[PDB]
Ligand binder design. Structure first.
Ligand SMILES: Nc1ncnc2c1ncn2[C@@H]1O[C@H](COP(=O)(O)OP(=O)(O)O)[C@@H](O)[C@H]1O
Lengths: 94, 443, 88, 93, 92, 85, 77, 89, 88
DNA sequence: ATCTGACACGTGCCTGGAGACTAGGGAGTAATCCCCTTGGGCGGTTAAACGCGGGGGACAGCGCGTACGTGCGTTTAAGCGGTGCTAGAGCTGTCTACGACCAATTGAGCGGCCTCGGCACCGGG
DNA sequence: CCCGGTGCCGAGGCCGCTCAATTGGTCGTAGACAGCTCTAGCACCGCTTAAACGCACGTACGCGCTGTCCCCCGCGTTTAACCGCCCAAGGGGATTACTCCCTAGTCTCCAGGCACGTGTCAGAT
């Protein structure tokens, strides 16, 4: 096809689905690594990591919508790092 | 083949009373003819019936080839793979109409388990035959749950090692073979009717005998220091004092047994895992820092005095790696096949190791790997650098080199360390061999 | 061949979030084209979020004398941060 | 008491919770009734909107995807769940 | 062993939409939404009690807590549903 | 003039206009009501602070689009990713 | 009474934030965003007041409302 | 209220400075607000664990869950030292 | 009482009043006093130091604001404070 | 140099400190048993990595014109000061009608057990 | 994009039983409310002067248009790692239900601090 038409295909299917992205095993490795720092030998139930993953994905999707707004404000379509850095500054996040 | 004729006399009998049997003839008799001989004997009345035979993959090639060779013709088909299995499903023959061409159905434990739906529809199966009974030694295994959905009016189990771990595996099987099912004699009353184990006794003196000898080693000072720091704690500090490349590392929640077994194997495993140690112990002498390593080295120098090729086994793959590092520094040429290496890659390595001219005498070889049916005979001596916690793996590994084609007499060197969990394990594996040895008494 | 000094190192756990997965999360947010320096930026913002939540969960746990972070410890951390999760 | 008023939610169970939740020393008699009558109203609204959602997708049962959608659609119920993240609920086109 | 409003959330549904099923993991959100709205209101009304230095959470308080949590027109139609009920309970 | 008001801590709106607006917008909630002369002061302080922040984020939003003149699109992009409405 | 928030004042506030040059349609927008804010805070204040049986918006009513909305206000009481 | 103590803390840290009247107000407000946050958190923590006592442990978790960052890591040390001195003596 | 400047007794009383819970331990009043004291000390230090820059011998609302704004921790605890009679 | 603040001080009355009970939740222990590490086996199979065009979009430069800032002279109307008036905030004292509590009573709703219709996955279209 | 037809499994169903919600007297206390004092909020006047307003004028910035070239996307092919199911044995770790003792609230007396009322003083306004 012509570049950009299969991309609008993907922004429709995924907005309609409710199936989670991010493989389950890598996220669970990351959380644990981030944890050993706080309490040595802390164990996570499975439901906990599940919840954490759900929340994270939502956070990132929201950030991604506001970083698209910011980019459009500058008369572009490509979202660049500056946009994220602008979005977070307006939301207060560290 | 008189025994195998008594092997077909007893499965024609089982067919008669209706009961259900677990032929337990020893490994080496063939383990292949007996099974197809019974399938071909059912030609009387009609071989044209539902028939199913689940087994690993390699078993399948041999089975088919034999059905082709010992007997002239038996509609046979290997239902292996997925999606490509859908076409041969119908190309074979009619759906349920069992003509004299309804081809024998040969599947694998995965296929059987994953898509039982397809085969669930078929009629009460005349005889489902499961090659390796040990697969079902757990009564909560998902294969067992999916294996009950099949409407089976008869069952059969092939094995050579009925019990390995304890009696509960005998219990779970007995539900499978017979749902209905001093004291030693009382057990032999229940089991005499079904079990038919012909030892390697009718055929004996087949190969030169072997010697299995345990040569202990004395735990060195540094390992003792590590062990006491593990019996209490601080082994995550005596190695974490440097605090580089990885800080606030996890606790060795490792069951004491296996964190102290890892020590008794080689302390580097802990040190590497603890500190950054971007580089291996380059001391190439610190590797000496393990007593069991030093006893291996001297043994090997005395066994190069003759050059007869050795075999090395281990439980993990980090430890074989340390060994390889050590020897490769000195310069020895090594070949190695663990589970990480690929299949066709490992098959050519053997084809080269089997090359007598080539001087790659050393051969690293993990324990649980190798599947079944490899042919390693160019070597003569096996060194079990670790123990098992299940002696039937040790017997298999020893037999892999103790098989047909070994003219030179074989030794076995089960290394170990005194005043530690290695000696504990040896006692455990010994009592498991004894659990099976008193059972061999029944016959 | 026996590796020399080099042992058997492994890839970092953060690099586990593959570029394909960031793209999929972006397209669900409505984005059209994505630059290339975006990926190394998303990773940091994921890390920060997670670090604030896990810290609270590990606190709420210890107070119960326990050593396992349940799912109710996570739900409380999020509620302290403004995000409320229904369904656990 | 639930019966004396037209409420369908349980007045007694709410009263007990309020009295046993250390919310204060002495709860009055009307406070359990009022709370029940507000909670019932709120639920009815959400459920009524979610139900209108399903028929559209041509299904006769509600799933988290429906409640999310309904909430996102309406303004007041959104100002209310301004941060809530329903599980397995997707996002609005 | 686990108290929940599931029984009552399915009675209101029937009353509003007569012929529609509910499904599971779907009333696992509706129950949570009720528990949370209860908590907020009660806590507000306690703070509203401790502030006004009274030891009693009465109806007046529950009402001023509703007016401050439930956002917008919901309030009005909730307040009404609720007051209606208190007068009704009174003439029993 | 940027420098001057960045060193001062004085009030920037006049007094009585702010009072009237606050009285009217109350009228549509409860007829007849009084207001301590300190309340109208608190309300002014707070409002003035709020507007300064909005303006500081709108300036950021304009520097993004490579301008220096502030425009109504900016206030709106600020207030939307803030969450205000 | 919202035209009493005159053009020079908006300009002064804007130079506190950091703005450099003001457009000309910026004023009506400012006058709207002030009104919304003032309308929320005052509603909450009048609620709190009535709850105390009074007719005088007073000390700690405004402060309490402003707190309620994420804006703690120290002093003024 | 806390005037004397805030006047005392100043004399100790900056021996020669004074403080106006509006400043004292701000300071007292700050102290009171921290107090309230800390205590409310502690009470909630208690309730979630079905406990009728607000012990020290809850004063510490509360300080960790609300004081942000290293600012807390110190406050915890400062509080532990003072409860130890009081208990031993 | 024994160790600090703040009124361990009064803090305790305030905990008894307000009905924060049924029972208050013995250490609970002691710990809170110390934390509040530390927090006040930090703020009073930066402000005076702020006043040591302006050279003003008297701490005024402006200094407190400036100090809170600068330091990275207090700016986080004190997120949106609007000190009366202060400025940016 | 002075006036808007800023600094002593007082009484007293009101609240912290101390001494003690009966109470009574919390620290201690034993138990059962069930989900949770760490290191390896084999077989699936779908997602992720890589390489290569090619085209679209980011970016820089230039030019016109229009809307913003500055300046100066009118004209509002805010700020201050002072006077008058009364609504209503704040507090006190009486007296009950309302909530806690206990006990007797028992039907509503709750854990585990039925079944069958609607709704996901396909190949076929 | 329709279309059957498929199963085929969870959405409704029922059912004793336990405990929790009613209903009735005392039971005391928490509530309303009636009345009085006096603060402070509102309305209005007159005058000064500072901030707002209107209009003219110049020019800096915003926006359209153009051209170059970087780098992102889509596709095909080869890689890889998530995902499943299995070892054995450890051995732990939570939840529940077990039990005794030392501290909470409770009094009760009695100490001596902090709150509203006053005199000083000194800065920076
Ligand atoms: N002890 C024995 N005595 C006689 N024949 C034997 C014995 N052991 C094995 N065999 C031979 O084994 C053959 C069947 O096994 P086959 O499938 O050919 O090979 P494998 O033994 O490798 O499975 C028979 O033809 C039989 O002659």
């Amino acid at each position: 096809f012509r570049p950009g038409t299969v991309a609008l295909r993907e922004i429709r299917k995924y907005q309609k689905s409710t199936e989670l992205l991010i493989r389950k095993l890598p996220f669970q490795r990351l959380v644990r690594e981030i944890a050993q720092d706080f309490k040595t030998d802390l164990r996570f139930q499975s439901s906990a990591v599940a919840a954490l993953q759900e929340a994270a994905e939502a956070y990132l999707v929201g950030l991604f919508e506001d970083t698209n707004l910011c980019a459009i404000h500058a008369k572009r379509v490509t979202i660049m790092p500056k946009d994220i850095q602008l979005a977070r500054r307006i939301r207060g996040e560290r | 083949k008189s025994y195998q004729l008594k092997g077909v006399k007893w499965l024609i009998s089982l067919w008669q009373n209706g009961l259900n049997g677990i032929l337990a003839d020893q490994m080496g008799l063939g383990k292949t003819i007996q099974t197809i001989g019974f399938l071909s004997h059912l030609k009387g009345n009609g071989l044209d019936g539902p028939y199913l035979v689940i087994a690993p993959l390699s078993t399948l090639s041999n089975w088919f080839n034999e059905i082709a060779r010992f007997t002239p013709s038996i509609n046979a088909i290997i239902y292996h793979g997925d999606k490509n299995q859908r076409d041969e499903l119908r190309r074979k023959h009619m759906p349920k109409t069992v003509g004299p061409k309804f081809p024998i159905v040969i599947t694998s434990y995965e296929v059987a388990m994953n898509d039982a739906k397809r085969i669930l529809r078929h009629y009460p199966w005349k005889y489902v035959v499961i090659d390796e009974g040990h697969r079902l030694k757990n009564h909560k295994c998902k294969l067992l749950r999916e294996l009950k959905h099949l409407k089976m009016d008869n069952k059969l189990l092939l094995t050579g090692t009925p019990l390995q771990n304890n009696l509960s595996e005998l219990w779970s099987l007995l539900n499978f073979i017979l749902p209905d099912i001093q004291v030693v004699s009382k057990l032999h009353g229940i089991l005499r009717p079904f079990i038919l184990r012909r030892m390697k006794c009718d055929v004996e003196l087949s190969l030169p005998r072997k010697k299995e000898i345990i040569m202990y080693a004395t735990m060195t000072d540094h390992q003792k220091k590590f062990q006491e720091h593990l019996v209490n704690n601080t082994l995550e500090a005596h190695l974490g004092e440097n605090a580089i490349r990885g800080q606030g590392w996890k606790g060795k929640l490792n069951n004491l047994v296996i964190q102290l077994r890892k020590n008794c194997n080689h302390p580097d495993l802990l040190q590497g895992q603890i500190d950054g140690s971007y580089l291996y112990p380059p001391v190439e002498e610190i590797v000496g820092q393990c007593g069991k390593f030093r006893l291996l080295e001297r043994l090997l120098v005395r066994l190069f005095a003759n050059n007869h090729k050795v075999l090395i086994f281990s439980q993990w793959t980090k430890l074989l790696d340390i060994m390889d590092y050590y020897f490769s520094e000195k310069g020895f040429e090594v070949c190695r096949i663990d589970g990480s290496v690929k299949l066709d890659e490992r098959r050519r390595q053997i084809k080269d190791f089997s090359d007598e001219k080539s001087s790659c005498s050393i051969f690293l070889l993990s324990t649980r790997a190798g599947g079944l049916g490899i042919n390693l005979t160019a070597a003569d001596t096996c060194i079990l650098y670790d123990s098992d916690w299940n002696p039937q793996m040790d017997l298999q590994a020893m037999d892999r080199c103790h098989r047909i084609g070994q003219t030179k007499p074989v030794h076995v060197y089960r290394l170990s360390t005194a005043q530690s969990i290695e000696t504990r394990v040896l006692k455990r594996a010994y009592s498991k061999l004894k659990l099976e040895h008193v059972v061999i008494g029944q016959g | 061949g026996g590796a020399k000094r080099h042992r058997k190192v492994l890839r970092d756990n953060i690099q586990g979030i593959t570029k394909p997965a960031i793209r999929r999360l972006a397209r669900r947010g409505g984005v059209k084209r994505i630059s290339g320096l975006i990926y190394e930026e998303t990773r940091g913002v994921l890390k920060i979020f997670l670090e604030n939540v896990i810290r609270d969960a590990v606190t709420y746990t210890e107070h119960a004398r326990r050593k396992t972070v349940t799912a109710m410890d996570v739900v409380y951390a999020l509620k302290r941060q403004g995000r409320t999760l229904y369904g656990f | 008491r639930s019966s004396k008023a037209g409420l369908q939610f349980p007045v007694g169970r709410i009263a007990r919770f309020l009295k046993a939740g250390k919310y204060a020393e002495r709860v009055g008699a009307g406070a359990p009734v009022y709370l029940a009558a507000v909670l019932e109203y709120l639920a009815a609204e959400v459920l009524e909107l979610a139900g209108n959602a399903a028929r559209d997708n041509k299904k006769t049962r509600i799933v988290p995807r429906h409640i999310q959608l309904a909430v996102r659609n309406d303004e007041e119920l959104s100002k209310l769940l301004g941060d809530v993240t329903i599980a397995n609920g997707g996002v609005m086109p | 062993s686990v108290e929940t409003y599931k029984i009552y959330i399915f009675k209101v549904l029937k009353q509003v939409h007569p012929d529609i099923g509910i499904s599971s993991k779907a009333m696992g959100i509706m129950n949570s939404f009720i528990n949370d709205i209860f908590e907020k209101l009660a806590s507000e009304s306690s703070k509203l009690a401790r502030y006004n230095k009274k030891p009693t959470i009465t109806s007046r308080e529950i009402q001023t807590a509703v007016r401050l949590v439930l956002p917008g027109e919901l309030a009005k139609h909730a307040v009404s549903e609720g007051t209606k009920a208190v007068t009704k309970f009174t003439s029993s």
